[model samples]
Target: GEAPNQALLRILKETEFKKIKVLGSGAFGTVYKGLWIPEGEKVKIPVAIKELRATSPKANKEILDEAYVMASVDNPHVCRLLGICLTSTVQLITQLMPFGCLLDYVREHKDNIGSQYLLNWCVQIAKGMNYLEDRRLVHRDLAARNVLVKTPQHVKITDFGLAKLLGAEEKEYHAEGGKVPIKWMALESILHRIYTHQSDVWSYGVTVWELMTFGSKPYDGIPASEISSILEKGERLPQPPICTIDVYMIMVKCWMIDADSRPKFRELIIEFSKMARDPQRYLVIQGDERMHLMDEEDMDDVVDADEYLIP
Candidate 1:
């Protein structure tokens, strides 16, 4: 029902899509590593182009709306959107993260990376969430896979396909119905289709668990079908051996059954700051011993222990 976006507002030509290489794919689209040369300039700059998969105009409208939502927020921790190209396929161009996503990086370097460094990544993510919180925006899909690492100390939050803005009187948004990430989603989100900043907080806790465990899957081998019942009974992810009591406590707070009981990014930022100030108090739990924890595929085989519940 709406007219096309201004044709004169072109950011990149179709020819610029030369030398494309696959980056990754999600439900929304496939992302690629590409090069762009400004019309007047000879230098080719590396970029990541997210080519939307939706062919229908209605689906493209939804994709454009997501891009606008991301464009509204400005923060160093959030990935920068360079431009959008409305070609045969909608392509979103952004700076390429040379180090790739957090999951792959942490898994590849877990043995060599120190706890302090991993914890620092946690703090950076919290800061980014705090910025989104101030704007009353909810990142429905906040996970390690969506977080990009520029360096050990520098990372940026990306992916906005599931993000939604809160209306002036709205405290939460309810999805009509769609595919959801079961393990990373909060209880209310799973049961009632309710989404809020608190739901994102729950996902962040899983992300921290991922960081501490070096990309281990949350909920392990517990089939997605049974996770709801398991969580209803007050079970949570088992603490990683490397995670300190202080850090594990924060993760527990985010998983509180009552969404309101979860800590906001503002409070989390302060807690992370305190942890940053006194790293020794909350860094090494087992003194680098690498205690054996349940493997993802073997979790279902292990009997439930009384200690699985945090409190």
Candidate 2:
């Protein structure tokens, strides 16, 4: 097989990407809404391009690894890796998600969204994570910020920079020095620098919390330094007013101190599937009081993260 860079070249030319707008910015790079014109085509296809901040060989290799890993996966609930472009700056291209990140979508549509549809998004995410699990990949950073939405019903997981392809015998990997998003990281990852599929399950629990609360920050005002001691005491985030008891139970199970006790992604898919099969039993329609509570929660918990803080 050709190298990642060579594979990228076969999909997209270097200079044909024209930046339309800046989508968002983060530790990895600034993502832009761009248009790609193939060599002989007059029509421009919409795409999202992430322009890297670090140009060192190390950083470039990480970028290439992300492209190769994501490019290899084929799932409807996973983001499509379009290719990469090497021009004045190196950019990783992907399909443009018109509705943007999942967090923002939940927050913006809180008033009108259907309860069943909301739960279905959670199912979709678990399905995507299950696919990654099947491939022996651990997405260390699974959060609402990393999931993209094309519509209320069509969501896909993205942001694979922190994703690791595990070896046959490996169950976990030690984190190399980097800026970890402490808020979204699991207890083991935060305290011991260890990441595993189980840790990702913990993050998925937090992500479900975000969806249920219409994008409330995971820890509210809790500082990153105090999360370990807090979790050690068996405390978890307050349940969202709109979330059903069953779903919240699943979230609590994911936050169990023992990683081995947490449900696997496949098990999560099956659990969510059971709920999806009978949404009447699982969906919690927001009443007027809960709607007011959600609005208040949205205003109080909106963190200053780039993914959800978009204008």
Candidate 3:
């Protein structure tokens, strides 16, 4: 198998590209900012290259999966797959989100946005998630850090490293249990060790929490081992200090015990869009005042790089 760092220079030469800087790193790979000077394009395009060590089976598989998924998707809200290079090393090419992930944006300016603006951001996420659903795919690891957004709320869902195909007619998937992000998983997924569109819905609930808190941690106080027990007993991801009534209801719907009762991606999009349609309502909703009652805690207290150590 190819080594990520060992073959990096050759991979760059083969790809005919120049390195910008090391954007991020993880257990199996490193991400570098690079320039993809398009042949016929007017301007030099900024791109992110995920260099994966072919030595690791998991890393290789993930790079392959991301390439296949991105190539199949051509939606605005989905990251555009520029290209890939496979050799002694694997390199994934993708468009640059000038401001990186939504989590970064929120962290920089959480107070800058009012409820109305935050809802608008959620609508962008819904758009991207719906596009993924339409493709019969499940983003098993959707979160604020995975969503990329630009001005006018142009959003794209990135990092398909944990995605999987939704097999036809309820087919079952089996795997040796590895590490799982318990807080972001649905009840069925936590127990059955299985995931379907419904499981993705459960993750989407946390995504909603991500939007409200501007990339806040999903489960702030709980440990991963307790997830199954808590979910089995009807417990759920708690809201942050700034959760609103309408937003909380939306999140609750996503965490519904009955997978069948969970709303579809299209429906979820509407819930998010409704907020954008009436920005004023966010401030004046009948129970808007109650939003302040939520627990007063910062999300940074919980989630760490281990949760989403991107490459």
Candidate 4:
């Protein structure tokens, strides 16, 4: 089968994309909110176009790597890859999540959100990650910032630029020269450049922490250089005030020093599913569109390169 670029020629044409405004900037390039008009179509649907920053072949391959890998993922909680645009420099198109990134969503709706729906978002994430783990695909980066939300209930994992598909024989991946996501990483990943399903589980734990805490930054007041020693000392993130004891337990399990000690995504899903069923037990509730938008200045459009190990 042809690649996404060739297969979706109708929409991939440069002329079809109307660049609206810059949405955000990141490691590879800037993302824009664009209106995409398909061939012979008058209607323009909103799409997020991730424009490439560098002209280097590696840059093109680097960003496009996400689209190719993402197309393999079909889970509802996983973000959809629309295609790429080559008419200009190069842009990777994706579904425009109106509510935007999960971090902002949680922060903005903290006062009005249902705790049950927050836990449900955790369940949905577990389903998506479990799907990836089952297929031997490792999402090297899993954080609230990488996740997108349509409504409070529909949380989808995005930012697959760091996603890797491992083979059956390969139990783990070792990328020696790449920048690593240190704050959300398991001990094994930060020390040895090794990543596996367990490491991803470790990240999922932190992501849940973010959801519970209204998108507060992990390792508050701590520097990346000190994260190693802190984890080495067996310390983990303290429980957030709003998070229930059961949900906090999940975070602690994920932060288990021995990667193997962490629960599988499947197990996490089952537990969350149980909690989701009894909303009163978990103080959970269905979340609605906050209909709350942020001012341009308050928008978290500056996607920081917080991942470490760059040399």
Candidate 5:
């Protein structure tokens, strides 16, 4: 585990990016789709880039930290930090996940999506988290918004290490002077300002909720100011109407008051894989429960025609 530094980062010339356009907004800033021309090749590479809010030393450190975390990773479920571009504002470049963020994907594709695909995404996410866990890295922010969809069945975890690399003020868990997502936080994190893999697990549960509800924000009626008090009293987000019982159970496990009581990423990987293998057992089917991950298109038909799988 090494401290993040500019020396550890890979720099790409700003002019290498031939052109760019706004793709979407990210947890910290705007995301852009760009065509990057490698020095040796005539062909341009399609890449997605995130902008830093400023070019100050502090902002550069924050962007460098995230790129450093992602650059060290080589997992399929995790987005690689291709490089950083020093433009008017610095850019953190990554592979173009043209499908956009998972939150937007689920919201826009609700009718065509099926339970099997959703479960597959969940498994991939757990696999990504498990990859980081083995490396002794903690994803300080693991929410649906932080996950980008590569395809219907694939997602890459992004926006990691937020507010985690602050030199001395990290104890406050401030997101570069911004507030943290209290609804996605664990009770221990909320009350004691501590974060761990277990804290990430808690956020994962909220992420699952966001996925099931087609990208609805967590704790709808409850005010953010009052979220801590309610959580301190042991209250939690209710099960989504479309979420499976077993999946909901996993969410509950992640929300345990004791962080240590939460399941590990490896355990979640296994549990999600098991659920994917047996969708009929976990999801509510209108009739005749026969499940397979193949024929995802036809699978949607089965659900649309008969309401076959509710989450």
Candidate 6:
């Protein structure tokens, strides 16, 4: 802990346990792996702890908001924010992500993990996102690094650092400010600093790309700003390997130039749920592995599939 966040360090020390193991890190915080035993039980329970620097007001507010949001969302598909030490500083306690970030896991097992498993994982993520949308929440930071898969096929959406709760009736009042991560920001969100629940819809499209390709990078060789502009210009990413006609259509609709035209989370959930329930709908996606990751394909299926034309 640094000088600005000494209060957070002190809080950690005051906690019942005094052990620390690193979990992961990001621009603003370091996540640690830790253990906490119940007062009466002799066994220890493992947990992941996140500590952020107490710096700018925006940083502080984001951390507080994450702490508040995690407690409220308790779903199997969503990662639960166990609790927080919210005194002079903030420290977050969360359920451990045994498989780690989805990106890291895929990188390590690219050769051994089958396509069916990857598709199943994608369904899990969609299920989690569906839960968030149903509750009218926007997890603005949707990425492979933020998604966690544990055991056989269980997945949980984590990292609420940038999430905001909104409603269908609400409209964004702000228009462009703060640091915009071009690759992930939807067209309208970047051009106008205005994000709604639909922005999550856009991020979900990106997430689908990430999942299908075993953690491939977004935007390829294109600059993030250019990508944002092109998306705003109604340019859509060509369907990658493993993406079916329906899947490609879903992504295209999510990134529609007009934010209002994007599919609602409910609609996306329904589509993906149907695909999951019927394996035949995903037959082509399951058969191809090269297009899914590592290899690039020149023949994107969308060019031939007329049904995929999205207005």
Task: Output the worst ten-in-a-row residue range by lDDT, candidate 6.
Answer: 1-10
Q: List the residue pairs that clash in candidate 4.
A: 116-284, 116-285
Give the per-residue lDDT digits (tens) of candidate 4, residues 1-311: 32232323224887787888888886667888888888777888888888766488777777777877676677888886787767557677877887898899888877777767777898999999998887668999999998898777788888888888787678889887757768999998988888999999999999998888888989989999999899999888988876668778888999887888899999999999998887556653334334342445654555546753476
TM-score of each: 0.83, 0.84, 0.80, 0.84, 0.82, 0.78
Worst 10 residues of 5 by lDDT: 166-175
* Model 6 Cα lDDT, one tens digit per residue, 1-311: 21221122112333544447776677778888888655556966677877775567777877877877787676888987666765465678777777798888877876555555655666677778878776667777787878886664777888886777665666553533456566777876776677766787788888877766767888778986587567756676678676677777888887777788988766765776677675445635444444232345555543445555776
Give the whole-model CA lDDT for all candidates, comma-separated: 0.82, 0.82, 0.71, 0.81, 0.78, 0.70
**Model 3 segments more than 4 A misplaced:** 1-15, 40-42, 171-175, 283-311
Q: Mind giving the per-residue lDDT tens digits that candidate 5 earns over 124-212?
A: 99999888765566677789988988877789898765724333323234233335788898877776667777788899989988987
Candidate 1 has its poorest 10 consecutive residues by lDDT at 1-10
Write candidate 3's Cα lDDT for 110-209 as tens digits: 6565666677767766777788776667877787778876563576888887777664554444434656677888777777777767677778778777
Q: What's model 1's lDDT at 13?
A: 77
lDDT of 6: 0.70
Candidate 2: worst-modelled 10 consecutive residues by lDDT: 1-10
Using lDDT as the measure, name the better of candidate 2 and candidate 4: 2
Backbone collision tally, model 6: 3
**For candidate 5, what is the total of clashing residue pairs?**
0
Per-residue error (Å), model 4, residue 283: 4.7
Task: Arrange candidates by TM-score, descending.
Answer: 2, 4, 1, 5, 3, 6
